Amino acid sequence: MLLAQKPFWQRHLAYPHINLDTVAHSLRLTGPLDTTLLLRALHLTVSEIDLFRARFSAQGELYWHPFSPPIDYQDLSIHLEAEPLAWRQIEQDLQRSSTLIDAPITSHQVYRLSHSEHLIYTRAHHIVLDGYGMMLFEQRLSQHYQSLLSGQTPTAAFKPYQSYLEEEAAYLTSHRYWQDKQFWQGYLREAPDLTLTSATYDPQLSHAVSLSYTLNSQLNHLLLKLANANQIGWPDALVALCALYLESAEPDAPWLWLPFMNRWGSVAANVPGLMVNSLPLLRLSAQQTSLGNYLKQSGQAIRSLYLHGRYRIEQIEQDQGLNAEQSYFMSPFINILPFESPHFADCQTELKVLASGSAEGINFTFRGSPQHELCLDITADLASYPQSHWQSHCERFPRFFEQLLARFQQVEQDVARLLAEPAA
Amino acid sequence: MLLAQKPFWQRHLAYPHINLDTVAHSLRLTGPLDTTLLLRALHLTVSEIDLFRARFSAQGELYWHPFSPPIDYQDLSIHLEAEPLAWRQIEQDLQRSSTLIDAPITSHQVYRLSHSEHLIYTRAHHIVLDGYGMMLFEQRLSQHYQSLLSGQTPTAAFKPYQSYLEEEAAYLTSHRYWQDKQFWQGYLREAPDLTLTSATYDPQLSHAVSLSYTLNSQLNHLLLKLANANQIGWPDALVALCALYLESAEPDAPWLWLPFMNRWGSVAANVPGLMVNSLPLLRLSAQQTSLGNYLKQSGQAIRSLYLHGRYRIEQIEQDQGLNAEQSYFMSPFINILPFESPHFADCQTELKVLASGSAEGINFTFRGSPQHELCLDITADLASYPQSHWQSHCERFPRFFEQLLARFQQVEQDVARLLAEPAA
Amino acid sequence: MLLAQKPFWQRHLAYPHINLDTVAHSLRLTGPLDTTLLLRALHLTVSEIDLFRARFSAQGELYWHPFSPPIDYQDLSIHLEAEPLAWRQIEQDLQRSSTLIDAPITSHQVYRLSHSEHLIYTRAHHIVLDGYGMMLFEQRLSQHYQSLLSGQTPTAAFKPYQSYLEEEAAYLTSHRYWQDKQFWQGYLREAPDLTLTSATYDPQLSHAVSLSYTLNSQLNHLLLKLANANQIGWPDALVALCALYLESAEPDAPWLWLPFMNRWGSVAANVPGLMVNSLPLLRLSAQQTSLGNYLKQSGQAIRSLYLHGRYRIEQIEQDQGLNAEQSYFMSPFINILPFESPHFADCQTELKVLASGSAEGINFTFRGSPQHELCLDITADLASYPQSHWQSHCERFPRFFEQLLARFQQVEQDVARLLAEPAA
């Protein structure tokens, strides 16, 4: 078992009767799709994912099931209560006991609701799949379907999970491992303390609240320009902007937590699994600096995180002295969700996140793309984050974007002029 | 548009009325050549070079013309004033006002002067073609003509430019990119300031003065014997010897500028275009060192620059805080061009460089090969370099080479011997 | 010549007659070995090792022989005086004159005793091969054999030695070089003086004595266990433990010398040769810390050595201001020998060390593996170490392990508890 999987494994031993870290998506395809080919496509995709065959012993020993995950298919086009019938079974799986010992970690269900309506349900435990893995699974499903439909030879399959283990093993014994430890050690030393997880925090008592604000299109164009002008992508740009925002909105929070996919330059880029790593970014001050210099310098600080990003935060926790019963309070946290839902010839795809872990602290999420629609979701777990502050963020963050777009207007949309003004 | 191209683009917008960065070669062929097949060969070679179909919008957007460039041919074997008619048209092109906007960037003219005389003129703007690229073009022309003459099938065609764009795009995203960034950052920290282009320098007021100096055979042999001995290529050997010559001839200049092809190991080796990168080499001191040790350690240094050579100098200028209106004064500069002229059966080839960049500073260009004829060309632009210094280089550089052969004669032409002696 | 090679060169000049530094193994293969394929395998293996072609001039210049070393094979199956004939020729080589100067630096002899018995002899002077080196050689020989036995094509050949020289030179001119210098400087300044080599010491007058103690399985499993707990390797854990035992067995000995292979993350990993660096570990205090806390911190310090290990100990001596006639007395010395003997299909391998170079002081060597069997080897040079203290160590070191095994059982195999009780 990988260090990154241990915390999930422990949470499970600590609250067995409940599925705290599940990942489930539903795909709704509307269109003249070829049922049979989709089923083959799904069966093919799943075969390529070695980790979906993972199983754990009572002692946490990971071992491998020899068969690929079953694909439960049902033609419901016959019944009038087709949809409700499909959703009862989907909820059934969501409400399953979700044990981990000697059991299948994933589930795959397909429903033909009508000749032009299909419902695909995919579920896994966070211990064998993260967000990026999920989309990889979706794109692959897409790829196999297109190949089957167009009668072409499909492109290459996911590399075996074993190739990733080997790569990870080599990294753990490499000098880079030590340069990384070195780097996080210095980063935190010359910095304000990180917040630990409360001793009285019960993961199951989570109580999530949320609000979504759709960013104005004019802001998206600016977002891009701003990104370009600083030789950074819009996701990294939003992380910078978000940190700038927190300068006023929550000055006492010196840290902004980020998820580094840990797929960059690695075979993991072709191996669905668990690799995401949570890292803390020390927000730069807005005092005595231009917005332009703020974005550029934040981007570098962020980049620096990615370069030493393969070093596990769990490991950092140990390096910093926390004991086994401790963990960092990764809040505030930012997530950028840029990936499109998987495509299928002559169909519309409606993707729905049915499960995705547990909310802790406050979370800022950006789903979509400045090229189309980009929304901001402000989610807080009232059991570990004050409701009023959450209230405040839902009113202040959106305004923050309204201003930026304004300061731009009142400067005749001159990218260089806006980057010219002070960060504050 | 690539970064390497931006500066040529800007120079054009700044001075539209002049051809600052044009490349043009004339190939005069003497022999009973097959005109029709030469034309075909030229037709096929230009069609394989995607970049020659490039064009730019007034906004600097590079788009693609669907047709290969035209090959303008003229049989002039009838006129009494044949050669003069050819050259008058060439000079005219060398005098056309460049226009990178929505216009063809290359020109191809062939002239049949007499049954045994042909003149080929090839012109491109530096923004789509460099030295190495020109030679790939000439060699390819030679290959095709030879294939057609013997009936054989031609060897593989140039890869598409798209492949290079992709490879480049990946490098810009890789870990190497950041490794290269840190490197140039360290290298420039541990060293004397680099010089910046005077702010009053006007590219058009350039005024280049030149002078050749063939190296006697005994030196060329010595160059090779020295290179082999230090297990390095003669070009680097030659670069070292210049580094050494400069130590005494121009001690108040620590840097020496070099061109890095960026061809080896990349698809660029099979894609004509612009890839050469000018990078600064910090001269090693000649004090306390044997000649041999100087050569080897210089080679080790050059190689170090090679490895990080894909990192763009324009990027470095930004990393080092220069602004949009500044740049490095890349002088002195030592440019080595080993390539031989293209060959055609039963013919002699006379290559003539009709246009190349534009003089800046003092330039040491070596053309040839130590096995054949190697001529040193000291060029200077009095508009940006001390005329007196230039003359002084013309005197002492050849003397430097003469003293070298001499000190060699001194110890019975014993390579080990000559190498054990002190550097200076 | 490399710095690590110079002291061997010196020893040879100072005592031309005696062959003081030799590494020589014998491998007895019992089974139905394919003689011919073995001989081919041996042939292929020696040909991949550039360094076995090294030869030294009178002035100590290292030059290269153009041919791979010969392999002398004799079928003694028909002869009656079999084994005696083999060993007699072996002893003759161990008893060669071979004044390093202009002589084959290695020897390879193969003997077929019967169709079931084969004896392989391999000798090299320590100046071109260390322990790891010898191991690599052995493993490559089994790879080749196996490859020829099965119809499989062999894996990659050892990289060329020039590769390593090129890497080392790069390191010497690097900043990493300077950091290592810094680390060693301070690590020594803030610590007790290292013991210099007695001026009245004569290498040729070595008088070795040894005695082996086989660590009982009970302990083996504990060793491994102890290793896991402190997230460290068992060899590193054995050093930590040896340093502990030395806290009350020779309290006046602040330092413990360790051999650092210096193969870690280097082409040297695929280049048999001399790279081992002897370094001083400042033994940590066994007071005011728990066993588990001692191991964890010992491993950290040990890690630091490896991390700065590329800096040469001979270089450190020069840095500490020692003159050419001086060196560090490297005693106590712990050596870990984990590697198994080469394996050949359907055969038995009985490895035997016939020469491993003379060593000063006292040495603690761990041969084998906790996974299977391992024996502690206490060896001493009476001409440089008190025979008394030696016998002292022979009785007291094992006891130290019976105590650890006992203090363990005496805590109901409670691993975390053993690691809770203070140092000693």
Q: Most C CBs within 10 Å: which of A178, A318, A319, as the mutation test of the C interface?
A: A178
Cα gap C16→B206, rounded to integer Å: 70
Q: Name every chain C residue with its beta carbon within 8 A of the beta carbon of A174.
A: 265
Which two three-digit tokens encode residue B98? 């460049």
CB contacts < 8 A, B to C, total: 10
- The method recorded for this entry reads X-ray
Q: In 3-state terms, what secondary structure has residue B236? A: helix
Which two three-digit tokens encode residue A215? 């960013």
Residue with structure tokens 């053993």?
Answer: C418
CB of A182 less than 8 A from some CB of C: no
Which two three-digit tokens encode residue C245? 């035992």
Cα gap A189→A192, rounded to integer Å: 8
Strand partners, A396: none
Tell me which chain B residue has its CA closest to the CA of residue A297: B319
Length of chain C: 424
Q: DSSP code of C109?
A: E
Contact flag A264-B175 (C-beta cutoff 8 Å): yes
CB of A349 within 8 A of CB of A343?
yes
Tell me which chain B residue has its CA closest to the CA of residue A230: B318
Q: Rounded to a whole number, what is the distance in Å from the CA of B423 to chain C's nearest CA?
A: 19
Q: Most B CBs within 10 Å: which of A307, A308, A415, A419, as the mutation test of the B interface?
A: A307
φ, ψ of residue A337 in degrees (nearest 5) = -115, 90
Q: Using alpha carbons, select from C251, C246, C307 the residue that is nearest to residue C277.
A: C307
Q: Name every chain C residue with its beta carbon within 8 A of the beta carbon of B300.
A: 166, 169-170, 173
Cα gap A405→A399, rounded to integer Å: 10
Which two three-digit tokens encode residue A174? 């490499």
Contact flag A307-B178 (C-beta cutoff 8 Å): yes
Type of residue numbered C116? S
Give the chains touching C; criterion: ≥3 Cβ pairs < 8 Å.
A, B
Nearest to B186 among C162, C173, C175 (CB): C175
Nearest to C169 among B186, B190, B300 (CB): B300
Q: Most C CBs within 10 Å: which of A172, A175, A180, as the mutation test of the C interface?
A: A175
Which two three-digit tokens encode residue B318? 């930004």
Residue with structure tokens 């919008």?
Answer: B57
Strand partners, B124: B23, B106
Q: What are the C-alpha distances in Å from A376 to residues A329, A330, A367, C148?
A: 22, 19, 7, 64
Q: Using alpha carbons, select from A329, A315, A364, A322 the residue that is nearest to residue A200.
A: A329
Type of residue numbered C341? S
Q: How deeply is B106 buried, as exposed, middle or buried, from its count of CB atoms within 10 A (0-12, 13-18, 19+)?
A: buried
Strand partners, A355: A24
CA A384 from centre of chain: 20
Q: Name every chain C residue with its beta carbon within 8 A of the beta carbon of A175.
A: 264-265, 307
Q: Most A CBs within 10 Å: which of B1, B178, B185, as the mutation test of the A interface?
A: B178
CB of C316 within 8 A of CB of C330?
no
Q: Name every chain C residue with its beta carbon within 8 A of the beta carbon of B231.
A: 162
DSSP B91-160: HHHTTS----BSS--EEEEEEEEETTEEEEEEEEETTT--HHHHHHHHHHHHHHHHHHHH-----PPPPP
Alpha-carbon Rg for chain A in angstroms: 23
CB of A307 less than 8 A from some CB of B: yes
Cα gap A352→B329, rounded to integer Å: 57
Tell me which chain A residue has its CA closest to the CA of residue B176: A265
CB of B151 within 8 A of CB of B283?
no
Q: Helix C161-172 vs helix C175-189: angle between axes, to the nearest 10 degrees?
A: 70
Report the run of H or E that residue C27 belongs to, with start and end: strand C22-30
Contact flag A175-C264 (C-beta cutoff 8 Å): yes
Tell me which chain C residue has its CA closest to the CA of residue A175: C265
Strand partners, C108: C122
Cα gap A128→A52, rounded to integer Å: 7
CB of B300 less than 8 A from some CB of C: yes
- Chain A, 85 to 124: residues with Cβ < 8 Å from chain C are none
Q: Name every chain B residue with its beta carbon within 8 A of the beta carbon of C173.
A: 297, 300-301
CB of C173 less than 8 A from some CB of B: yes
Q: Is the peptide bond before B386 cis (omega within 30 degrees of 0)?
A: no
Q: Is the peptide bond before C332 cis (omega within 30 degrees of 0)?
A: yes
In chain C, the domains with their CATH numbers are: 1-158+262-275+340-358 (3.30.559.10), 159-190 (6.10.250.80), 191-261+276-339+359-424 (3.30.559.30)
CB of A175 less than 8 A from some CB of C: yes
Which two three-digit tokens encode residue C402? 């019976």
Strand partners, C282: C255
Contact flag C265-A175 (C-beta cutoff 8 Å): yes
Q: What are the C-alpha distances in Å from A232 to residues A223, A334, B172?
A: 11, 17, 12
Q: How many other CB atoms sit within 10 Å of the CB of residue A110? A: 22
Q: Rounded to a whole number, what is the distance in Å from the CA of A382 to chain C's nearest CA?
A: 38
Give the chains touching A; criterion: ≥3 Cβ pairs < 8 Å.
B, C
Q: Name every chain B residue with its beta carbon within 8 A of the beta carbon of A307.
A: 175, 178
Resolution (in Å) of the shown entry?
A: 2.5
CB of B175 less than 8 A from some CB of A: yes
Residue with structure tokens 């203290």?
Answer: C389
CB of B231 less than 8 A from some CB of C: yes
Strand partners, B110: B73, B120
Strands A22-30 and A348-356: antiparallel
Type of residue numbered C259? P
| Number of H-type helices and E-type strands within chain B | 12, 13
Residue with structure tokens 């802001």?
Answer: A219
Q: In 3-state terms, what secondary structure has residue A81? A: coil
Strands C348-356 and C22-30: antiparallel
CB of A79 less than 8 A from some CB of B: no
CB of A324 less than 8 A from some CB of C: no
Q: Rounded to a whole number, what is the distance in Å from the CA of A234 to chain C's nearest CA?
A: 36
Sorted by sequence, the CB contacts under 8 Å of residue B268 that are 6+ apart come out as: B164, B167, B262, B275
Contact flag C265-A178 (C-beta cutoff 8 Å): no
Q: Most A CBs within 10 Å: which of C180, C307, C308, C310, as the mutation test of the A interface?
A: C307
Q: In 3-state terms, what secondary structure has residue A346? A: coil
Residue with structure tokens 């105590």?
Answer: C403
Cα gap C280→C183, rounded to integer Å: 13
DSSP B256-301: EEEEE---TTSGGGGS-S---EEEEEEPPP-TT-BHHHHHHHHHHH
Cα gap B91→B93, rounded to integer Å: 5
Q: Name every chain B residue with its beta carbon within 8 A of the beta carbon of C162.
A: 231
- Chain A, 235 to 264: residues with Cβ < 8 Å from chain B are 264
Q: DSSP code of B342?
A: P
Q: How many other CB atoms sit within 10 Å of the CB of residue A217? A: 12
